[PDB]
CSV table of C-alpha atoms in Angstrom, one decimal:
chain,number,residue,atom,x,y,z
A,1,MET,CA,-19.4,-23.7,-40.7
A,2,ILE,CA,-15.9,-24.9,-41.0
A,3,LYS,CA,-13.1,-22.2,-40.5
A,4,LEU,CA,-10.3,-23.2,-42.3
A,5,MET,CA,-6.7,-21.1,-41.2
A,6,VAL,CA,-4.5,-22.1,-44.6
A,7,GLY,CA,-1.1,-21.6,-44.9
A,8,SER,CA,1.1,-18.6,-46.5
A,9,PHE,CA,1.5,-20.6,-49.7
A,10,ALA,CA,-2.1,-21.7,-49.9
A,11,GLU,CA,-2.8,-18.4,-49.0
A,12,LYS,CA,-1.0,-16.2,-52.1
A,13,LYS,CA,-2.5,-19.3,-54.9
A,14,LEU,CA,-5.9,-18.3,-53.8
A,15,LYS,CA,-5.1,-14.6,-53.9
A,16,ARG,CA,-3.9,-15.2,-57.0
A,17,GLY,CA,-7.0,-16.4,-58.7
A,18,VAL,CA,-6.0,-20.3,-58.4
A,19,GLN,CA,-9.2,-22.2,-57.4
A,20,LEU,CA,-7.8,-25.6,-56.8
A,21,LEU,CA,-6.7,-26.7,-53.4
A,22,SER,CA,-3.7,-28.3,-53.4
A,23,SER,CA,-2.8,-31.5,-51.1
A,24,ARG,CA,0.5,-30.3,-50.9
A,25,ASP,CA,-0.8,-27.1,-49.4
A,26,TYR,CA,-3.2,-28.7,-46.9
A,27,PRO,CA,-0.8,-31.3,-45.3
A,28,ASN,CA,-2.6,-31.8,-42.0
A,29,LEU,CA,-6.5,-31.3,-42.8
A,30,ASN,CA,-8.8,-33.4,-41.1
A,31,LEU,CA,-12.2,-32.1,-42.9
A,32,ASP,CA,-13.6,-33.5,-45.9
A,33,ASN,CA,-16.7,-33.4,-47.8
A,34,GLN,CA,-18.5,-30.5,-46.8
A,35,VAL,CA,-18.2,-26.2,-47.6
A,36,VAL,CA,-16.1,-24.1,-45.8
A,37,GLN,CA,-14.4,-20.8,-45.1
A,38,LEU,CA,-11.0,-20.1,-45.9
A,39,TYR,CA,-9.2,-17.7,-43.7
A,40,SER,CA,-5.7,-16.5,-43.7
A,41,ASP,CA,-3.5,-16.7,-40.8
A,42,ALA,CA,-4.5,-13.3,-39.8
A,43,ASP,CA,-8.0,-13.8,-39.5
A,44,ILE,CA,-8.7,-12.7,-43.3
A,45,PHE,CA,-11.1,-13.7,-44.6
A,46,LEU,CA,-10.3,-15.4,-48.1
A,47,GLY,CA,-13.6,-16.7,-49.7
A,48,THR,CA,-16.3,-19.7,-49.7
A,49,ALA,CA,-15.0,-23.4,-50.8
A,50,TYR,CA,-15.7,-27.0,-50.8
A,51,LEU,CA,-13.7,-29.8,-49.6
A,52,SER,CA,-14.0,-33.1,-51.6
A,53,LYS,CA,-10.7,-35.3,-52.6
A,54,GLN,CA,-10.0,-35.3,-56.5
A,55,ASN,CA,-6.7,-36.6,-57.4
A,56,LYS,CA,-4.2,-34.6,-55.9
A,57,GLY,CA,-7.0,-31.9,-54.8
A,58,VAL,CA,-8.8,-31.9,-51.6
A,59,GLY,CA,-10.8,-29.1,-52.8
A,60,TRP,CA,-11.7,-25.8,-55.0
A,61,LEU,CA,-12.1,-22.6,-54.0
A,62,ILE,CA,-15.8,-21.6,-55.0
A,63,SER,CA,-15.7,-17.7,-54.4
A,64,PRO,CA,-13.9,-14.8,-52.4
A,65,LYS,CA,-17.4,-13.9,-51.3
A,66,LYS,CA,-19.5,-15.4,-48.8
A,67,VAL,CA,-22.0,-17.4,-50.6
A,68,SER,CA,-24.2,-20.5,-50.4
A,69,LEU,CA,-24.4,-23.1,-53.0
A,70,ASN,CA,-28.2,-23.2,-53.7
A,71,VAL,CA,-29.8,-23.4,-57.3
A,72,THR,CA,-29.5,-20.5,-58.1
A,73,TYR,CA,-25.7,-20.0,-57.8
A,74,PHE,CA,-25.3,-22.3,-60.2
A,75,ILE,CA,-27.9,-21.3,-63.0
A,76,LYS,CA,-25.5,-17.8,-62.5
A,77,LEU,CA,-23.0,-20.0,-63.3
A,78,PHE,CA,-24.4,-21.9,-66.0
A,79,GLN,CA,-25.4,-18.7,-67.7
A,80,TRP,CA,-22.2,-17.4,-67.9
A,81,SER,CA,-20.5,-20.8,-69.2
A,82,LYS,CA,-23.3,-20.7,-72.0
A,83,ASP,CA,-22.7,-16.8,-73.0
A,84,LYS,CA,-19.0,-17.6,-73.3
A,85,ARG,CA,-19.3,-20.5,-76.3
A,86,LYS,CA,-22.5,-18.6,-78.2
A,87,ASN,CA,-20.0,-19.4,-81.3
A,88,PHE,CA,-20.6,-22.9,-80.7
A,89,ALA,CA,-23.7,-23.5,-80.3
A,90,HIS,CA,-23.8,-21.7,-83.4
A,91,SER,CA,-21.9,-23.5,-85.8
A,92,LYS,CA,-23.1,-26.7,-86.7
A,93,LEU,CA,-19.8,-28.1,-88.0
A,94,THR,CA,-19.2,-29.0,-84.9
A,95,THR,CA,-22.0,-30.5,-83.0
A,96,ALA,CA,-20.2,-32.1,-79.8
A,97,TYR,CA,-17.9,-29.9,-77.6
A,98,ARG,CA,-17.6,-29.0,-74.3
A,99,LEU,CA,-20.0,-26.6,-72.6
A,100,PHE,CA,-18.6,-26.8,-68.8
A,101,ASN,CA,-14.7,-27.5,-67.9
A,102,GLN,CA,-14.2,-27.7,-63.9
A,103,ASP,CA,-12.4,-24.3,-62.6
A,104,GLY,CA,-12.3,-23.1,-66.4
A,105,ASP,CA,-15.8,-21.9,-65.7
A,106,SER,CA,-15.6,-21.3,-62.0
A,107,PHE,CA,-17.0,-24.7,-60.6
A,108,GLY,CA,-14.0,-27.4,-60.3
A,109,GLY,CA,-15.3,-30.8,-60.0
A,110,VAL,CA,-17.6,-30.7,-63.0
A,111,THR,CA,-17.8,-31.1,-66.7
A,112,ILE,CA,-20.4,-31.2,-69.1
A,113,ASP,CA,-20.3,-31.7,-72.9
A,114,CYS,CA,-23.0,-31.6,-75.5
A,115,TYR,CA,-23.2,-34.9,-77.8
A,116,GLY,CA,-25.4,-33.7,-80.5
A,117,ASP,CA,-28.7,-33.5,-78.6
A,118,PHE,CA,-27.8,-35.0,-75.3
A,119,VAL,CA,-25.4,-33.6,-72.6
A,120,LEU,CA,-23.0,-36.0,-70.6
A,121,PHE,CA,-22.2,-35.0,-66.6
A,122,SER,CA,-19.2,-35.7,-65.6
A,123,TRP,CA,-18.8,-35.9,-61.6
A,124,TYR,CA,-15.3,-35.7,-60.1
A,125,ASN,CA,-15.7,-36.1,-56.6
A,126,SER,CA,-18.6,-37.5,-54.1
A,127,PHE,CA,-19.3,-33.5,-52.8
A,128,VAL,CA,-20.5,-32.2,-56.0
A,129,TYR,CA,-22.5,-36.0,-57.0
A,130,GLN,CA,-24.0,-35.8,-53.5
A,131,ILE,CA,-25.3,-32.4,-54.5
A,132,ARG,CA,-26.0,-32.8,-58.0
A,133,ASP,CA,-29.8,-32.4,-58.2
A,134,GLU,CA,-29.6,-28.8,-57.7
A,135,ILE,CA,-26.7,-28.6,-60.1
A,136,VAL,CA,-29.1,-30.6,-62.8
A,137,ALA,CA,-32.0,-28.8,-61.7
A,138,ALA,CA,-29.7,-25.3,-62.2
A,139,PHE,CA,-28.3,-26.7,-65.6
A,140,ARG,CA,-32.1,-27.7,-67.2
A,141,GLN,CA,-33.1,-24.5,-66.8
A,142,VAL,CA,-30.6,-22.7,-68.5
A,143,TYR,CA,-30.4,-25.3,-71.3
A,144,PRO,CA,-33.9,-26.3,-71.9
A,145,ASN,CA,-33.3,-28.0,-75.1
A,146,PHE,CA,-31.4,-31.0,-74.9
A,147,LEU,CA,-33.6,-34.3,-75.4
A,148,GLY,CA,-31.5,-35.9,-72.9
A,149,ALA,CA,-28.3,-36.5,-70.1
A,150,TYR,CA,-26.2,-39.0,-69.4
A,151,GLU,CA,-23.5,-39.0,-66.5
A,152,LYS,CA,-20.3,-40.3,-65.5
A,153,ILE,CA,-18.7,-41.1,-62.0
A,154,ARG,CA,-15.0,-40.3,-62.0
A,155,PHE,CA,-14.4,-40.9,-58.8
A,156,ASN,CA,-21.4,-47.9,-61.8
A,157,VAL,CA,-19.4,-45.6,-63.4
A,158,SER,CA,-22.0,-44.6,-66.5
A,159,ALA,CA,-26.4,-44.0,-65.8
A,160,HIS,CA,-29.2,-42.3,-67.9
A,161,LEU,CA,-29.7,-38.7,-66.2
A,162,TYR,CA,-32.6,-37.1,-67.2
A,163,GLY,CA,-35.1,-36.7,-70.5
A,164,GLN,CA,-35.1,-39.3,-73.6
A,165,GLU,CA,-32.8,-42.1,-73.7
A,166,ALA,CA,-29.9,-41.8,-76.6
A,167,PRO,CA,-29.2,-44.4,-79.6
A,168,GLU,CA,-26.4,-46.8,-77.5
A,169,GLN,CA,-24.4,-45.4,-80.3
A,170,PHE,CA,-24.8,-42.1,-82.4
A,171,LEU,CA,-23.1,-39.9,-85.1
A,172,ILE,CA,-22.0,-36.3,-84.3
A,173,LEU,CA,-19.9,-33.7,-86.5
A,174,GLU,CA,-16.6,-32.4,-85.5
A,175,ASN,CA,-14.8,-30.1,-87.9
A,176,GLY,CA,-17.5,-31.1,-90.4
A,177,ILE,CA,-16.9,-34.8,-90.3
A,178,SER,CA,-18.5,-37.5,-88.8
A,179,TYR,CA,-17.5,-39.6,-85.6
A,180,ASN,CA,-19.2,-42.4,-83.8
A,181,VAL,CA,-20.0,-41.8,-80.0
A,182,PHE,CA,-21.6,-43.5,-77.3
A,183,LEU,CA,-23.0,-42.5,-73.9
A,184,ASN,CA,-23.8,-44.7,-71.7
A,185,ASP,CA,-20.8,-47.8,-72.2
A,186,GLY,CA,-18.1,-47.2,-69.6
A,187,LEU,CA,-15.9,-43.8,-68.9
A,188,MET,CA,-15.2,-42.6,-72.0
A,189,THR,CA,-17.3,-42.0,-75.2
A,190,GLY,CA,-15.8,-43.1,-78.4
A,191,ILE,CA,-13.7,-39.7,-78.7
A,192,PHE,CA,-11.7,-37.4,-76.9
A,193,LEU,CA,-13.5,-33.8,-77.7
A,194,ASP,CA,-10.5,-32.1,-76.4
A,195,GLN,CA,-8.1,-33.2,-79.7
A,196,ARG,CA,-10.1,-31.5,-82.2
A,197,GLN,CA,-8.2,-28.7,-83.4
A,198,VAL,CA,-5.7,-31.5,-83.7
A,199,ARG,CA,-8.0,-33.7,-85.6
A,200,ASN,CA,-8.5,-30.4,-87.5
A,201,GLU,CA,-5.0,-29.9,-89.1
A,202,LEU,CA,-5.0,-33.8,-90.6
A,203,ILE,CA,-8.5,-33.3,-92.1
A,204,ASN,CA,-6.7,-29.8,-93.1
A,205,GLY,CA,-4.0,-32.0,-94.9
A,206,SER,CA,-1.0,-32.1,-92.7
A,207,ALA,CA,-0.7,-36.0,-93.5
A,208,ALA,CA,-1.9,-35.4,-96.9
A,209,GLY,CA,0.2,-38.3,-99.5
A,210,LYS,CA,1.6,-39.4,-96.5
A,211,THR,CA,1.7,-42.8,-94.7
A,212,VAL,CA,0.7,-42.6,-90.9
A,213,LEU,CA,0.7,-44.7,-87.7
A,214,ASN,CA,-1.3,-44.1,-85.0
A,215,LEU,CA,-0.8,-45.4,-81.8
A,216,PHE,CA,-2.8,-46.1,-78.5
A,217,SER,CA,-5.5,-45.1,-81.5
A,218,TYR,CA,-8.4,-46.3,-79.2
A,219,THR,CA,-10.8,-45.8,-82.1
A,220,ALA,CA,-8.8,-44.5,-84.2
A,221,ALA,CA,-10.2,-40.9,-84.4
A,222,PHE,CA,-7.1,-39.6,-85.7
A,223,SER,CA,-6.7,-42.4,-88.7
A,224,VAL,CA,-10.3,-41.1,-89.9
A,225,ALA,CA,-9.3,-37.3,-89.6
A,226,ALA,CA,-5.8,-37.8,-91.9
A,227,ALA,CA,-8.0,-40.2,-93.9
A,228,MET,CA,-10.5,-37.1,-95.0
A,229,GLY,CA,-7.2,-34.8,-95.3
A,230,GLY,CA,-5.8,-37.0,-97.9
A,231,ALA,CA,-3.7,-39.4,-96.2
A,232,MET,CA,-1.9,-41.9,-98.4
A,233,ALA,CA,-2.2,-45.0,-95.9
A,234,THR,CA,-3.1,-45.3,-91.9
A,235,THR,CA,-2.0,-48.0,-89.3
A,236,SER,CA,-4.2,-48.1,-86.5
A,237,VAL,CA,-2.6,-49.6,-83.3
A,238,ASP,CA,-4.9,-50.3,-79.8
A,239,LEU,CA,-4.8,-52.8,-77.5
A,240,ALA,CA,-7.7,-53.2,-77.0
A,241,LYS,CA,-10.2,-55.8,-79.5
A,242,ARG,CA,-12.7,-53.3,-79.1
A,243,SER,CA,-10.8,-51.0,-81.0
A,244,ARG,CA,-12.1,-52.4,-84.3
A,245,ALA,CA,-15.9,-52.2,-84.5
A,246,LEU,CA,-15.6,-48.9,-82.8
A,247,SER,CA,-12.8,-47.5,-85.7
A,248,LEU,CA,-15.1,-48.9,-88.4
A,249,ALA,CA,-17.6,-46.4,-87.5
A,250,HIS,CA,-16.0,-43.5,-88.2
A,251,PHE,CA,-14.7,-44.3,-91.4
A,252,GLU,CA,-18.4,-46.2,-92.4
A,253,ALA,CA,-19.7,-42.5,-91.3
A,254,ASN,CA,-17.8,-40.7,-93.5
A,255,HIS,CA,-18.0,-43.3,-96.4
A,256,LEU,CA,-14.1,-44.0,-96.7
A,257,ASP,CA,-13.1,-47.1,-98.7
A,258,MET,CA,-10.3,-48.7,-96.2
A,259,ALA,CA,-8.0,-50.6,-98.8
A,260,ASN,CA,-5.2,-48.3,-97.7
A,261,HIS,CA,-6.5,-48.3,-93.7
A,262,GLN,CA,-5.4,-51.0,-91.3
A,263,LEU,CA,-6.5,-51.5,-88.3
A,264,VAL,CA,-4.5,-53.8,-85.8
A,265,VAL,CA,-4.7,-54.7,-82.2
A,266,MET,CA,-1.7,-55.6,-80.1
A,267,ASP,CA,0.3,-53.7,-77.6
A,268,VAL,CA,2.2,-50.9,-78.5
A,269,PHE,CA,5.3,-52.2,-78.0
A,270,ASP,CA,4.9,-55.7,-79.6
A,271,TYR,CA,3.9,-53.5,-82.5
A,272,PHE,CA,7.1,-51.6,-82.6
A,273,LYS,CA,9.0,-55.1,-82.9
A,274,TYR,CA,6.7,-56.3,-85.5
A,275,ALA,CA,7.4,-53.0,-87.5
A,276,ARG,CA,11.6,-53.4,-87.2
A,277,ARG,CA,11.1,-57.2,-88.0
A,278,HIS,CA,8.9,-56.2,-91.3
A,279,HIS,CA,10.9,-53.1,-91.6
A,280,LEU,CA,7.7,-50.9,-92.0
A,281,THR,CA,7.9,-47.1,-91.6
A,282,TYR,CA,5.5,-44.4,-91.7
A,283,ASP,CA,6.2,-40.7,-92.4
A,284,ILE,CA,4.0,-39.8,-89.6
A,285,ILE,CA,3.7,-41.6,-86.3
A,286,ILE,CA,1.0,-40.1,-83.6
A,287,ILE,CA,1.5,-41.4,-80.2
A,288,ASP,CA,-1.2,-40.8,-78.0
A,289,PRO,CA,-1.1,-43.2,-74.5
A,290,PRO,CA,-4.6,-42.8,-73.0
A,291,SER,CA,-4.6,-40.8,-69.1
A,292,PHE,CA,-7.1,-43.4,-67.8
A,293,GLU,CA,-2.3,-49.3,-64.4
A,294,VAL,CA,-1.7,-47.9,-67.9
A,295,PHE,CA,1.2,-46.4,-69.5
A,296,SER,CA,3.5,-44.2,-67.6
A,297,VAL,CA,4.1,-41.0,-69.3
A,298,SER,CA,5.9,-39.4,-66.9
A,299,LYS,CA,8.5,-42.2,-66.9
A,300,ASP,CA,8.4,-44.3,-70.0
A,301,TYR,CA,6.8,-41.6,-72.5
A,302,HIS,CA,11.0,-41.6,-73.7
A,303,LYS,CA,10.3,-45.1,-75.1
A,304,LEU,CA,8.0,-44.4,-77.5
A,305,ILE,CA,9.5,-41.5,-78.9
A,306,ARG,CA,12.8,-43.5,-79.1
A,307,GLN,CA,11.5,-46.8,-80.5
A,308,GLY,CA,9.1,-45.0,-83.5
A,309,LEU,CA,11.8,-42.9,-84.5
A,310,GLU,CA,13.3,-46.0,-85.5
A,311,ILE,CA,10.3,-46.6,-87.7
A,312,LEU,CA,9.8,-43.1,-89.0
A,313,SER,CA,10.7,-42.2,-92.5
A,314,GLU,CA,13.2,-39.6,-93.4
A,315,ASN,CA,12.0,-36.2,-93.3
A,316,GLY,CA,9.2,-37.7,-91.4
A,317,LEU,CA,6.8,-36.1,-88.2
A,318,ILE,CA,6.1,-37.0,-85.4
A,319,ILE,CA,2.9,-35.7,-83.2
A,320,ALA,CA,3.3,-36.8,-79.2
A,321,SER,CA,0.2,-36.5,-77.4
A,322,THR,CA,-0.7,-36.5,-73.4
A,323,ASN,CA,-3.6,-36.0,-71.2
A,324,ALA,CA,-1.2,-36.3,-68.8
A,325,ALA,CA,-2.2,-33.5,-66.1
A,326,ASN,CA,0.6,-34.3,-63.6
A,327,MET,CA,3.3,-34.1,-66.1
A,328,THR,CA,3.9,-30.2,-66.9
A,329,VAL,CA,4.6,-28.9,-70.6
A,330,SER,CA,8.6,-29.1,-69.9
A,331,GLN,CA,8.3,-32.2,-68.1
A,332,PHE,CA,6.8,-33.5,-71.4
A,333,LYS,CA,9.2,-32.4,-73.2
A,334,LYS,CA,12.5,-33.8,-71.3
A,335,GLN,CA,10.8,-37.0,-72.3
A,336,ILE,CA,10.4,-36.2,-76.1
A,337,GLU,CA,14.2,-34.9,-76.0
A,338,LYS,CA,15.2,-38.2,-73.9
A,339,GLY,CA,13.8,-40.4,-76.9
A,340,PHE,CA,15.6,-38.3,-78.9
A,341,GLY,CA,19.2,-38.9,-77.8
A,342,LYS,CA,21.0,-36.6,-79.7
A,343,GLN,CA,19.0,-37.0,-83.1
A,344,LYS,CA,18.6,-33.9,-85.0
A,345,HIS,CA,15.0,-32.6,-84.8
A,346,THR,CA,13.2,-29.3,-84.4
A,347,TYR,CA,9.8,-28.7,-82.6
A,348,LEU,CA,7.1,-27.1,-85.2
A,349,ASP,CA,4.0,-26.9,-82.7
A,350,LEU,CA,2.6,-27.4,-79.5
A,351,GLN,CA,-0.8,-27.3,-79.0
A,352,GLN,CA,-3.4,-27.5,-75.7
A,353,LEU,CA,-6.6,-27.1,-74.7
A,354,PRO,CA,-9.3,-25.6,-77.1
A,355,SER,CA,-11.5,-22.8,-75.9
A,356,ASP,CA,-14.3,-25.0,-75.0
A,357,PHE,CA,-12.1,-26.8,-72.3
A,358,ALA,CA,-11.5,-24.0,-70.5
A,359,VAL,CA,-8.6,-23.1,-68.4
A,360,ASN,CA,-8.2,-21.0,-65.4
A,361,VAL,CA,-5.7,-18.4,-67.0
A,362,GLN,CA,-4.6,-17.8,-63.1
A,363,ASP,CA,-3.3,-21.7,-62.8
A,364,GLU,CA,-1.8,-23.2,-65.9
A,365,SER,CA,-1.6,-27.1,-64.8
A,366,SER,CA,-5.2,-27.1,-65.3
A,367,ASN,CA,-4.4,-26.8,-69.1
A,368,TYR,CA,-3.8,-30.6,-69.1
A,369,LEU,CA,-3.5,-31.4,-73.0
A,370,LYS,CA,0.4,-31.2,-74.8
A,371,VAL,CA,0.4,-32.2,-78.5
A,372,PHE,CA,3.8,-31.6,-79.6
A,373,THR,CA,4.1,-31.8,-83.6
A,374,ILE,CA,7.8,-32.0,-84.6
A,375,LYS,CA,10.1,-32.9,-87.4
A,376,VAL,CA,13.0,-34.8,-88.3
């Protein structure tokens, strides 16, 4: 079809294994939504790719060879992604995890999650969306035993896709504890599976006997995890009224008494001021602003750290999390340092995407989750 000659920079990245086609490296592109063949300036074949706008990307490399995107091509892709996850589908301690993660599984633009007996497809660009029938057909052959499927449009945003319908809300298990989720209500599902290992640490006792403040709680999944790990008390703060019922659902599923678990609906900065006013301090403060115009991580994260430190107990901990794909680990660390000023602190750990949210090893920028555990 269209033979796209690429620049020197675009070339080295392609040869290095970078699948994402950055807008910055394809400045004057007049093409879109179609399969193309990439060539160097020396007229050498670099691979098969598809174009479609996706945030800062203009497309994805499909393969370094000449191939066509038919149903068989996707069957092969899903067979490989499935084989790498045998241990997940095996263990019943976690029944919700990611089955396919864009370039981490060699096909950017598509993610697929499993939530118990149902699956959730997510389309990140119009191109994959237009060819989704073959993609789904291929998936159903490789994973024939799911009861039903739903889809999210990430570019109506949610819809039932195939098979049986799922209860509007149901429970899944993660790290052996229950969480309430929903598959056909907006873009989100009630939980962010990529933070599973952070919740595991909390359930394990990282906050045992400690008081916890969870900012931008969403559905308070971190709070329930901490509660199951023996936290003395937890306060979950979210700007959305919806957070109440959705948070209660997790606590109820785990039969937890909530005498020492508070759910607050308030702007996070307004809560910082309220806390200062009422002398409220916490041993552990979790900060995880939505990456969904929502809070600017790249610019204002230092404010969350600064104000959080003002209400943090002596020898306390801060768990600074972000799913901002546009921020590097170093850029994030710089925002945290900015908030700390000259107050002494130690970085205890950095956790990023878990194995199911497969990352392209040749492209570390795909590892969007960054969680820093810091002691003061």
